[PDB]
Fold Neuraminidase.
Amino acid sequence: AEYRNWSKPQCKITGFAPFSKDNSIRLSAGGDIWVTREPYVSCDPGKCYQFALGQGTTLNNRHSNDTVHDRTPYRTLLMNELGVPFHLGTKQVCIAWSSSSCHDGKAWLHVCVTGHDENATASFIYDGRLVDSIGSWSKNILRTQESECVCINGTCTVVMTDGSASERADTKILFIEEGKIVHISPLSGSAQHVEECSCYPRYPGVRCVCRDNWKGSNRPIVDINVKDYSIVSSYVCSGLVGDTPRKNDSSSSSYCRNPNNEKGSHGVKGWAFDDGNDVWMGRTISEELRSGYETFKVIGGWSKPNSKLQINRQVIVDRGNRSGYSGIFSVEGKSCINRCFYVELIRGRKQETEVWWTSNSIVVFCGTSGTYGTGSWPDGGDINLMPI
Amino acid sequence: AEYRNWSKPQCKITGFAPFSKDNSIRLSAGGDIWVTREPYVSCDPGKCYQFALGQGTTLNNRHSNDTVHDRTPYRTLLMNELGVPFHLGTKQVCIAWSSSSCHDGKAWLHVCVTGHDENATASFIYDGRLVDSIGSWSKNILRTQESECVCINGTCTVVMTDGSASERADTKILFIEEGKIVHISPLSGSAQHVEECSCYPRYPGVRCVCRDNWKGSNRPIVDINVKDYSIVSSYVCSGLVGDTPRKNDSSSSSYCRNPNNEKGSHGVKGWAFDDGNDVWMGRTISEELRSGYETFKVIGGWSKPNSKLQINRQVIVDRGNRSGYSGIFSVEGKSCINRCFYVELIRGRKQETEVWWTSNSIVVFCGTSGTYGTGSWPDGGDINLMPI
Amino acid sequence: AEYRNWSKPQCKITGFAPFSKDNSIRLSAGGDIWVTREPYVSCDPGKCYQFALGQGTTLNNRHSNDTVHDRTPYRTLLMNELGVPFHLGTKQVCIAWSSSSCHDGKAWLHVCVTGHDENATASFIYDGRLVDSIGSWSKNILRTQESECVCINGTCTVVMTDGSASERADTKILFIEEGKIVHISPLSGSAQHVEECSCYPRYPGVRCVCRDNWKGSNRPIVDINVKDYSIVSSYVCSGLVGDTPRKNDSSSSSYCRNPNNEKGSHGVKGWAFDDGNDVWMGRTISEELRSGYETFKVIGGWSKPNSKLQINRQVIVDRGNRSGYSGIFSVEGKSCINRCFYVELIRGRKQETEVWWTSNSIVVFCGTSGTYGTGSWPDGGDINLMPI
Amino acid sequence: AEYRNWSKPQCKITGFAPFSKDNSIRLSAGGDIWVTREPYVSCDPGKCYQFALGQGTTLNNRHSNDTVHDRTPYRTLLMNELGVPFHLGTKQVCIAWSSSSCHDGKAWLHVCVTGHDENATASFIYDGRLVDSIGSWSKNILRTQESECVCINGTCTVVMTDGSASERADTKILFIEEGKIVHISPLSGSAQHVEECSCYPRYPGVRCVCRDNWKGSNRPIVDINVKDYSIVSSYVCSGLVGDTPRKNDSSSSSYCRNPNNEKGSHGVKGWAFDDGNDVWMGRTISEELRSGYETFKVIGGWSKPNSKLQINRQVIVDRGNRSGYSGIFSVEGKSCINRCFYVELIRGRKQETEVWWTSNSIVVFCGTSGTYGTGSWPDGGDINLMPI
Ligand SMILES: *[C@@H]1O[C@H](CO)[C@@H](O[C@@H]2O[C@H](CO)[C@@H](O[C@@H]3O[C@H](CO[C@H]4O[C@H](CO)[C@@H](O)[C@H](O)[C@@H]4O)[C@@H](O)[C@H](O[C@H]4O[C@H](CO)[C@@H](O)[C@H](O)[C@@H]4O[C@H]4O[C@H](CO)[C@@H](O)[C@H](O)[C@@H]4O)[C@@H]3O)[C@H](O)[C@H]2NC(C)=O)[C@H](O)[C@H]1NC(C)=O
Ligand SMILES: *[C@@H]1O[C@H](CO)[C@@H](O[C@@H]2O[C@H](CO)[C@@H](O[C@@H]3O[C@H](CO[C@H]4O[C@H](CO)[C@@H](O)[C@H](O)[C@@H]4O)[C@@H](O)[C@H](O[C@H]4O[C@H](CO)[C@@H](O)[C@H](O)[C@@H]4O[C@H]4O[C@H](CO)[C@@H](O)[C@H](O)[C@@H]4O)[C@@H]3O)[C@H](O)[C@H]2NC(C)=O)[C@H](O)[C@H]1NC(C)=O
Ligand SMILES: *[C@@H]1O[C@H](CO)[C@@H](O[C@@H]2O[C@H](CO)[C@@H](O[C@@H]3O[C@H](CO[C@H]4O[C@H](CO)[C@@H](O)[C@H](O)[C@@H]4O)[C@@H](O)[C@H](O[C@H]4O[C@H](CO)[C@@H](O)[C@H](O)[C@@H]4O[C@H]4O[C@H](CO)[C@@H](O)[C@H](O)[C@@H]4O)[C@@H]3O)[C@H](O)[C@H]2NC(C)=O)[C@H](O)[C@H]1NC(C)=O
Ligand SMILES: *[C@@H]1O[C@H](CO)[C@@H](O[C@@H]2O[C@H](CO)[C@@H](O[C@@H]3O[C@H](CO[C@H]4O[C@H](CO)[C@@H](O)[C@H](O)[C@@H]4O)[C@@H](O)[C@H](O[C@H]4O[C@H](CO)[C@@H](O)[C@H](O)[C@@H]4O[C@H]4O[C@H](CO)[C@@H](O)[C@H](O)[C@@H]4O)[C@@H]3O)[C@H](O)[C@H]2NC(C)=O)[C@H](O)[C@H]1NC(C)=O
Ligand SMILES: *[C@@H]1O[C@H](CO)[C@@H](O[C@@H]2O[C@H](CO)[C@@H](O)[C@H](O)[C@H]2NC(C)=O)[C@H](O)[C@H]1NC(C)=O
Ligand SMILES: *[C@@H]1O[C@H](CO)[C@@H](O[C@@H]2O[C@H](CO)[C@@H](O)[C@H](O)[C@H]2NC(C)=O)[C@H](O)[C@H]1NC(C)=O
Ligand SMILES: *[C@@H]1O[C@H](CO)[C@@H](O[C@@H]2O[C@H](CO)[C@@H](O)[C@H](O)[C@H]2NC(C)=O)[C@H](O)[C@H]1NC(C)=O
Ligand SMILES: *[C@@H]1O[C@H](CO)[C@@H](O[C@@H]2O[C@H](CO)[C@@H](O)[C@H](O)[C@H]2NC(C)=O)[C@H](O)[C@H]1NC(C)=O
Ligand SMILES: CC(=O)N[C@H]1[C@H]([C@H](O)[C@H](O)CO)OC(C(=O)O)=C[C@@H]1NC(=N)N
Ligand SMILES: CC(=O)N[C@H]1[C@H]([C@H](O)[C@H](O)CO)OC(C(=O)O)=C[C@@H]1NC(=N)N
Ligand SMILES: CC(=O)N[C@H]1[C@H]([C@H](O)[C@H](O)CO)OC(C(=O)O)=C[C@@H]1NC(=N)N
Ligand SMILES: CC(=O)N[C@H]1[C@H]([C@H](O)[C@H](O)CO)OC(C(=O)O)=C[C@@H]1NC(=N)N
Ligand SMILES: [Ca+2]
Ligand SMILES: [Ca+2]
Ligand SMILES: [Ca+2]
Ligand SMILES: [Ca+2]
C-alpha cells in the first residue's frame, strides 16, 4: 500500500456517462432505509463508497417527523459501498452533522463535526481510530465540505468554515497526516465567503470550487499548495454561474475575482473543474429552487472573464424534478485521473408537505472520453404512495 | 491474478444437475425483496454471482404496481453471490435496463444501458470504475445480452443491437479491454435478426446462440473471432427449434442458414451449445407461452440440417408452471470447461392479474458427467397469498 | 492451504460447555427469519458455520403454513457463520431436502439431494462449482446424513441411503475427491438399517453413529477405511440406548451386534463417540417424544455389551421442552481434536397446533477438559405470542 | 500477526472527542433491532467492534416484554463492527448473561457465562473454538467484567466474581493463553468488594477500576502482574467518587484504601485511569440515578487522598437524560496508547413505564491531545413514539 500522489494528467472528457443510482426513497416505502441528507461519494484505490449524514432514524419510523433540521446529536456519517442503499446494516463511522472523508492510499480519514452550534467539535478519525480533534474557533457552527477531501503523498487537505452564513466568516484549510493536524492555513485571496468546497487533486496541489452564501451566485475557487501551505482564492470566470439562487443566463455575470452580488445570498453545494481554458460545471436547472440538474462545458469558462459560450449540455435531472447538493470526486485510471459527480435528490419537507420527513436519494455520473445519449434520472418516489 | 483463456476442452455432459434456486417470490411475501426481471449468472474464478435488472422497488411496496414495463430510469443491475436473494443490502452495480457482465480473470466488467429509448447510453464499468461509454447508433433502444459476456486473454466480447424489434436491425460486437472499447465489428453472415445472445467461450473464440425476434423461431448463432475480429452467423441446425413462439415438433424446421419463417415474430432469450455433431439446448415446454422448461440433446443437431433425433430429455419446470428467459454460463473446472444455465421464473402481470406487480425468481442447473433423476423446480409462489 | 488429516489424538473430555445458540424462533416473531429443519454445524480451519434445510419461506409469511412436510422443490441448504440467524441475507448454497457438508482444508464440499421421491438427484458441489452427481439407485428417497461429512488427506466420505424406512435398504458410502466421486462402497457388517449418520474423524479412518429406523433403538456404528474403502458396521454397546423411541433404562438392551428389537421402528438423528472403553452420547430425555436432551458417559459403554454404568450427566434441554435432531462435529485444536454437538429445537406442528408452521432453532455445546455447572437452554419461543 | 504488548506510553489527554453513536433505540421503532444491555467496545489491531448482551429478541417483538431481567438462557453476546447497530444479521458469538472479550493481537478471546444462578458455567472461546471452561466456585452468580479484557504478550487477564452482591465475595483473576486458563489468582489487597472491572493495559501490567456493590461509593482499583501473577488492590484516591449511588461532592470522601461507607450499597459499572498524580474519570451526573454523564480530571486524584480539585469537565449526556453502564477501552496509536470509553444509554422499564421492554443504545468518546467544544449526545428515542 503506497500513498496516492494523483500524479497523472486529467482524462479527456466529452461529457458524463451514468455510473450509479440508489433509488433509496422508492425502497424506503417497502423496507427499513435511513433518513439522510448531504450525501457524497469517495473511492479507495479499488472501489467507491457512498456517504451521507443520517438523521438517526429510518424513514418508515415515527422519528422521521420533522427531519428537515440540519443539526442534531443523532446525526452520524453513514458509509456503504456505492450502490448499496442505506439499510439497517449500514455502518455509522462517526457522529456528525457535517463531514468530509477521503482515502490517502493506505487508509480512510473521516472529518466529523458535532455538538453545540456555538461550540462544536471536529474529530479526525484515521484507519479506524481517533487521532485528533479541534474545537470551534469562531463559535458559530464549525462546518466542512460535505464531500471528499483530497490527499497527496499522505497529506490530506480539508476546508472548514466557522462564523456567519450571511457575512464575513473564518475559513481555514487543514493539512492532515495519518489523522493528525500538522498545519492550518487561514483562507486568503479574493473569495469573500467559502462553504461546502468540492475539491479535487490537480497535481501538485488541490483545487476546490465552493459555495458563496453571502454576496455571490458565482462560485468561489480555492487553490491549496500542499508543499508550502499557501492558499489563494478567486471565483469561477464563467458568466454562466453555478449557484442557486442566481440571475438568468443573460443577466448573470462573473469577472473571476469578486462575488457578483447577483442574488448572492443563500446557495447550494456544487462543483466545477478546469480543462485548460475551458470549464466543466453542473448546476440546478431552476434559478430559484433546487430543481433539475444540468452539466455543460463553457468554452473559455476557466480563463476568460464572463464567458457564456456553452457546448455539450446534458440533462441529468429534468427541470420538473427535485435535485439538491452536488459534488465532485476523482477516480484514478490506468493513465489518467477521471472526474465524476453525484447529485442529491431531496424529497419531503418543506417543499413537499404530503409527508412529515425530509430525505434524499442519489444519482452519480462519471466523465467519459466516449459518446453518450440523453435521459433523465430523478428520484422516482411517488410522494402520494410514501409512508407519511 | 492471470487473465482467463478458457483453453481447456468442454466437459463431458450427460445432462444437467440441480445447482441453485433462490425462491425469491415466496420470500417476497414475508420480507423486503427487490422486484426484478432479466436475471443471469456469471462467476469469477472462485465463485458464482446472480444478477438481475431491478425495478427500483421491493415487491411489498406501493411502487411495485405496474412493474411490467421494460425500461425506466429506476432500473439498476443487482449483483449478489449466487443463492443470496435480492434483499435490501444488495449492491446496485450500475444504472441499467439492459446489461451484460463478465470477469476477465482479474476484474468484473459491467455493460449497462439506460436513458431515452431514442438515445440511450451504454456505460462500461471495469474494476469498479467507468472506463468507456457509447451512445445509441440507430436511435431505437440500444440493448445487449441480459447474460454473461466472455473474455479471452483480457479481451471481452459483448453483442449489442440497436434498431427494430420487427425488421432488420444494427447488431454490433464490441471488443473490450480493461473496460475500454478497442474494436467494434458489425454483425455479418446469414442471421437476419439477433438479440439477447447467450454466449460461451469455445477456445480460441466465442460462440453465441441468440433470439431472432423477426422471422425466426430457430435460434441464430454468432461466432466471434477475438484475434481478427471477424464475425460469422447462421442458425442452429436442429429441427426441434428453441424459440417461443414456435410451431409443433412435427411442423417445425431449420436448415442451418436462414430464419425458418415459422411463427417467427416475438421470441424469448434462450441458449444452446455444441458437442461435436450434437447440440444441447433448452426451451419452454409451451410453444406459445413462457411456461414449462425442458432440456435435451439432439443427435446430429449441430451439423445435420433439420435433425429431430432427441435423447436425454429432462424437465426443469413442469408445463403447468411459468418460466421465462434462460441463458448459459461457463465454469472452469480442473481439466475442462463446464456449461450451466439459469431459468427466469416470471410471476405476476400481465398473465397473472391477482397482483399488480411483475417479478421473477431463478433456478440454476449445471452440466454433469454423472447421473441424475427427475423433478420439477418451479417458482413456488402462491399467487393468492402474495401482497398485491 | 493444506488438506486436513485430523491426525491428532482426541481431546480429554470431562463433559460439554455452552458454545452457541441462535434463538431464531423468538427472533422470527419480530423479523424476517427462514423456516428451517434438519440443522447442523461444520467448521472450516478458522471458523464454524451453521447449516439448515430451508422451506423456501420465512416464518412470518403465508407460505409458512403446513411446513411440516419433509420434501419440496423449494427446500435449499442455508449456510451462515455460526451464531448468525437465518435472516434474508443468508446464502442458499444448493437445492436440497437432504444434505451433508464438510471442508477438506482447502474448500467446502456440499452434498445436496432434491427432486422426485422415486428418482432423486444428489449434486456434489466443491469450491463453488458442481463437480459430480448421482441418481437414485433404489428409487425410494435417496437421502444422506443431515450433518457434517469428514475428509482425510483430501478424500471426503459421506453416507447415503436409498430404499425403505421400515425394512432392509441400500446404504452406500461415497468417497469424494475435490467434488468427484472416486469410489462407492455398499454398507457391510451387522447394522441392519442405517440413516442420518453422525460421523467424525478417528484417524486413520472415519467413524459414524447413526439411526436405525427399522428394528433398533440402539444406534448403529459404521466404520469407514479411507485407504482400502472397506466398511464394517455394528451397534453401540451401551445398554442405555440413544434412539427415540426406546424402552426405559431398566428394560433397554444392546449387545453390540444386532438391532435390539425394542420399540425399534422410527427414530431420531443422534450421535455418540468413543473414548477407549467408554462412550459419550446424547439423547432425548423423553423415551417417546423429541423432548428434553441429556448427555452422559457410560463407563464400559464402548466395549462392554449392555453396560449401563453412567456418570457425568448434563441436562442440555429440560424434559419439559422440545428438542429434535442432534449431531456431532469435530474441531481441530492446537494438540487435539475436540468433539462438539448441536441440538435442533423443533417448534410448531404437528405437536403444537397454536401455529400452522414447523420450524426450529439451535443450541450448540463443545467438549471441555475443564469444569462446568448446570443449566437448561431451550428454544424459548412463546407459542402463544408467535405469528400463526 | 504478533501478540500485542501495549509497550508504548499513554497518550497525552486534554479531554475526550466524539467517536461513535449507534442510535439503536430510535432505529428500533422502524426496523428489527436486538434488545440489549451491558454493551462494550473492544478493538482488534485494525478496527473496533461493539458488543452487548442480547435478550434473545428484537424490540418490536412480543418477546421484548419484561426484558428487565438480568439472566436468561436466551441471552447471547452480540458482536458487530463499531457503528453497525444490532440488526438481524448480527453474530451471536456465545451464550452469555455476563461477558468479557479481547484481542491478543492474533485472535479474539470471548469469556461467556450462562446457566443456573447457583451453578453457572464460563466458556473460554478463542480463535473461533472452545478452549476451556470453569464452573461456579461459590455457587452464587459467577460473573465478569462486561467490558474488554486485556492481553500482554499472549497472556490475557480477566476479573471474575462469584458470591454475594451485598457482602464479602470471591473474586479471582484468570490468566488465559490462547483460550486456555493457565493460572487463577484470588483477589488480594484492601478492596472489599469487586465487580464489573474496567481494565486497561499499563505496561508491564494491567490496571482495573471496578464497582464496589457493598460498602463503597468510591471505586476499587485492582492491579494485575502478568509475570508473577500477584494481585494488589485499593480504592481510587479522588474525593470526587465515581459510583452511583454516592453522596454529594462536598460530603463524599475517599482515602485510597478502604470502602468509604457512603451510600455504598448498589453501584454502576464505571471507569477511571491514571496520569501520573492525576486521575481521569467518568460518572453519572445524578448521585442517585443512572442519569447524565460527565467526565473530568481530578488534580492529585490518583496519589493524594481525598483530592477534589477538578478541571476539564465535559458533559457527555445532559442531566435530564438517561445513562447507564460505562467502561474503558484502549487503542494503540503510532507512538502511544489512547484511552476511550463508552456509555450505555438505558431506556424502558422499570424507570420508563410507557413501554414493557428494557434496552439501550450506546455513545463512545476517545481521548484527544487536541481541542474540543461542548454538546450532549443522549439516546434520543421518544418513549411516546416507541412500539410498546
Ligand atoms: C442524443 O444525445 C446527444 C448527446 O447528449 C445529443 O447531442 C448533444 O446535444 C446538445 C443539445 O443540442 C448539445 O449541447 C448544445 O451545444 C450547443 C453548441 O453546439 C452547436 O454549435 C456549435 C458551434 O456553432 C457546433 O459546432 C455544434 O455542432 C452545434 O451545432 C450549445 O449552443 C447549446 O447550448 C444552448 O442550448 C441549450 C439547450 O440545448 C440551452 O440550455 C443553452 O442555454 C444554450 O442556449 C442559448 O445559447 C445558444 C448559443 O450557445 C444560442 O442559440 C442562444 O443564446 C440560446 O438561447 C448546448 O450546449 C451537445 O453538444 C450535444 N452533444 C454532443 C456530444 O454532440 C443529441 O442532441 C441527442 N439527440 C436527441 C434528439 O436526443
Ligand atoms: C429417472 O430419471 C432418469 C434421468 O432423468 C430418466 O431417464 C431418462 O428418461 C428420458 C425419458 O424417457 C430419456 O429421454 C428420452 O430419450 C428418448 C431416446 O432414448 C430411447 O431410445 C434410444 C434409441 O432407440 C435408446 O438407446 C434408449 O435406451 C431409449 O430407449 C427420446 O425418444 C425421448 O424423446 C421423446 O420422448 C419425450 C418424452 O419423454 C418427448 O418429449 C420427445 O418429444 C420425444 O417424443 C417423440 O420422439 C420419439 C423418438 O425420439 C418418438 O417415440 C415419437 O416421435 C415421440 O412422440 C426422450 O428424449 C432420457 O434419455 C433418460 N435419461 C437417461 C440418462 O437415461 C428415467 O426415465 C427416470 N425414471 C422415472 C420413472 O422417473
Ligand atoms: C453443579 O454442576 C455440576 C456439573 O454439572 C454437577 O455435578 C454433576 O452431577 C451429576 C448429577 O449427580 C453427575 O452425574 C451423575 O453421576 C452419577 C455417578 O457419580 C456418582 O457415583 C460415583 C461412583 O460411586 C462417584 O465416584 C461420584 O462421586 C458420584 O457420587 C450417576 O449415577 C448419575 O446417573 C444417575 O442419576 C441421574 C440423575 O442425576 C439419572 O438420570 C441416571 O439415570 C442415573 O440414575 C440411576 O443410576 C444410579 C447408578 O448409576 C442408581 O442410583 C439408580 O440406578 C438410578 O436410578 C449421573 O450420571 C455428574 O457426574 C456431576 N459432574 C461432575 C463433573 O462432577 C453438580 O451436581 C451441580 N450442582 C448443582 C446442585 O447444580
Ligand atoms: C466550549 O468548550 C470548552 C471545552 O469543553 C469549554 O471549556 C471548558 O469549560 C469547563 C467548564 O468551565 C472547564 O471545566 C472546569 O474547570 C474548572 C477549573 O478551571 C478554572 O480554574 C483554573 C484554576 O484557577 C484556571 O486555570 C482555569 O483557566 C479555569 O478558570 C473547574 O473548577 C470546573 O469544575 C467546577 O465547575 C463545574 C461546572 O462547570 C462543576 O460541575 C464542578 O463541580 C466544579 O464546581 C465546584 O468547584 C469549583 C472549584 O474547582 C468551585 O468554584 C466550587 O467548589 C464549585 O461549586 C470545571 O471542571 C474546562 O476546563 C474547559 N476546558 C478547556 C479545555 O478549557 C468552554 O467553556 C465552552 N464554552 C461554552 C460557552 O460552551
Ligand atoms: C432575464 O432577466 C432580466 C433582468 O430582470 C430581464 O429583463 C427585464 O425584463 C422586464 C420585462 O419582462 C423589463 O421590464 C425590465 O426592464 C428588464 N430588466 C432589465 C434590467 O433588463 C429579462 O427579460 C430576462 N430574460 C429572460 C429570457 O427571461
Ligand atoms: C402440428 O401442427 C400441424 C400444422 O398445423 C398440424 O396439422 C394440421 O392439423 C389439422 C387437424 O387438426 C388439419 O386440418 C390440417 O390439415 C393440418 N395442417 C397441416 C399443414 O398438416 C398437426 O396436427 C399438429 N400435430 C400435433 C400432434 O398437434
Ligand atoms: C420399565 O418398563 C418395564 C417394562 O414394561 C416395566 O415393567 C412392567 O411394569 C408393570 C407394572 O407397572 C408390570 O405389570 C409388568 O409386569 C412389567 N413388565 C415387565 C416385563 O417387567 C417397569 O415398571 C418400568 N420401570 C419404570 C421405572 O418405569
Ligand atoms: C450535601 O449533603 C450534606 C449532607 O447531608 C448536606 O448537609 C446537610 O444539610 C441539611 C440542610 O439542608 C442540614 O440540616 C444538615 O445538618 C446537613 N448535614 C450535614 C451532615 O452537614 C449539604 O447541604 C449538601 N450540600 C448541597 C450543596 O446539597
Ligand atoms: C452545518 C450545517 O448545518 N450546514 C448546512 C448548510 C448551511 O446552513 C449553509 O451552508 C449556510 O452556512 O446549508 C444546508 C442547505 O441545505 O442549504 C445544509 C447543511 N446541513 C448540514 N450540513 N447538516
Ligand atoms: C431493452 C428491452 O426493453 N429489452 C426487452 C426485450 C425486447 O423488447 C425484445 O428483445 C424486442 O426487441 O423483450 C423482453 C421480453 O420479455 O420479451 C424484455 C426485455 N426487457 C429488458 N431488457 N428490460
Ligand atoms: C429425506 C427425508 O425426508 N428425511 C426425513 C427423515 C426420514 O423420513 C426418516 O429417516 C425415515 O427414512 O425423517 C425426518 C424426521 O424428522 O424423522 C426428517 C427428514 N427430513 C428431511 N431430511 N427433509
Ligand atoms: C450477572 C449479573 O446479573 N450482573 C448484573 C449486575 C449485578 O446484579 C450486580 O453487579 C450485583 O452483583 O447488575 C446489573 C445492574 O444493572 O446493576 C446488571 C448485570 N446484568 C448482567 N450482567 N446481565
Ligand atoms: Ca450564493
Ligand atoms: Ca422469434
Ligand atoms: Ca429406531
Ligand atoms: Ca457502591
User: Anything to note?
Assistant: Residues B 38, 53, 70-71, 97-98, 141, 143, 146, 165, 195-196, 213 surround zanamivir (ligand 10) (CB under 6 Å). The CA atoms of residues 35 and 58 of chain B lie 5 Å apart.
